[PDB]
């Protein structure tokens, strides 16, 4: 199966919301207003709060004042899969080796550097993708 959190946020709105799909079925519906991982749950809530803070800092990272609908497909397929899209177009990906986001888009490097400024955020993403996502996938497969 393939676990995929559909991270999404809007700079000028539900400011931030996650749609965790363990397979084609959706199992997690996180929202910024609630601040909790509404369908173990505490750790996922903390991780998604970190992701929400990263998305807010990414919104601050973009120089343009126009709307920005940031999206992402974070997860692991049992292999980590990180694909971030700005305004509905993929712009950056998280390199596991170098352990940092990037792409040809200038906004990709701006957001990657802004998230790198956050304390251990790149390694938080490394733990989330390489370790936390497969751990949650296996735990949910055994449980369900």
């Amino acid at each position: 199966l393939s676990l995929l959190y559909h991270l999404t946020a809007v700079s000028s709105p539900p400011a931030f919301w996650v749609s965790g799909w363990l397979g084609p079925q959706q199992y997690l519906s996180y929202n910024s207003l609630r601040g909790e991982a509404e369908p173990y749950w505490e750790k996922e809530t903390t991780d998604l709060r970190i992701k929400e803070k990263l998305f807010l800092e990414a919104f601050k990272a973009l120089g343009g004042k126009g709307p920005y609908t940031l999206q992402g497909l974070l997860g692991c397929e049992l292999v980590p899969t990180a694909k971030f899209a700005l305004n509905g177009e993929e712009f950056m990906n998280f390199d596991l080796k170098q352990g940092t986001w990037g792409g040809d888009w200038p906004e990709a490097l701006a957001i990657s550097q802004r998230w790198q400024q956050q304390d251990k955020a790149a390694n938080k993403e490394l733990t989330f993708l390489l370790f936390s996502c497969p751990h949650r996938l296996r735990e949910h497969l055994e449980r369900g």
């Binding site: 390199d95 596991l96 080796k97 170098q98 352990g99 940092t100 990037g102 792409g103 040809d104 200038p106 490097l109």
Partner: protein, 238 residues
């Protein structure tokens, strides 16, 4: 004895230190060193070697021999479209990485020097054409027409007896060293190939020929800052 003060940087295992150390086997008689051919003394000597570039990263075409072959064909279709187009940085560009030059750079953090891209024609001997390969320095977008390509640095390759014309891209970097990693600052230009003239082939010759790009390094090429390669990413114990 002699008064000595333990300066900062003591009782530490710096990974990049050249400190001496007592030997495990004193007065050990090492095997006499024979003249083994191929004494590599610099990693750039390995980078300097023309190495086939997987230009064609298309899905399925990679993890194969279609990755290295640039499909150059006899046709009127998409001859004002690039034969290939990638970024010049051997470090983080998916095309120029994972080769002698690219993997050599990936073991470092800063690189410099001109890159020679040797384009070897693999087709029929009767096939004749002209391919214009252009390195565009950063500051503008990737070339979208051959008109935009000839403005920058370009080489016109006449397919023929040599058929291995090399675009030795220059060093137009703002800084002395570029960044191996994906850095928008001090990034390299873009390599785009176009059809100066269509490769005319006789009826007996195949229409679709191939091109192999060879990334190598010049006498001007150098790297500065050592680092662990991000390519490996060892999962665990072997």
């Amino acid at each position: 004895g002699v008064p000595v003060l333990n300066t900062p940087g003591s009782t530490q295992f710096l990974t990049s230190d050249d400190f001496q150390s007592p030997s495990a086997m004193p007065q050990f008689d090492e095997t006499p060193e024979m003249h083994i051919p191929g004494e590599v003394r610099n990693l750039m000597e390995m980078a300097e070697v023309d190495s086939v570039v997987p230009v064609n990263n298309i899905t399925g075409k990679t993890k194969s021999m279609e990755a290295y072959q640039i499909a150059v064909g006899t046709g009127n279709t998409d001859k004002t479209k690039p034969i290939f187009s990638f970024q010049m940085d051997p470090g983080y560009s998916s095309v120029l990485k994972r080769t002698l030059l690219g993997e050599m750079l990936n073991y470092y953090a800063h690189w410099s020097g001109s890159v020679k891209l040797t384009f070897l024609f693999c087709g029929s001997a009767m096939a004749t054409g002209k391919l214009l390969i252009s390195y565009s320095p950063p500051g503008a977008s990737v070339p979208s027409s051959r008109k935009d390509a000839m403005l920058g640095t370009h080489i016109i390759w006449d397919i023929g007896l040599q058929s291995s014309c090399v675009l030795c891209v220059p060093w137009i970097s703002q800084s002395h060293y570029r960044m191996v990693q994906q850095d928008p600052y001090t990034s390299a230009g873009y390599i785009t190939c176009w059809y100066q003239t269509n490769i005319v082939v006789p009826p007996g010759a195949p229409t679709s020929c191939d091109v192999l790009c060879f990334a190598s390094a010049c006498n001007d090429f150098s790297v500065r800052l050592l680092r662990d390669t991000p390519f490996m990413a060892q999962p665990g114990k072997l």
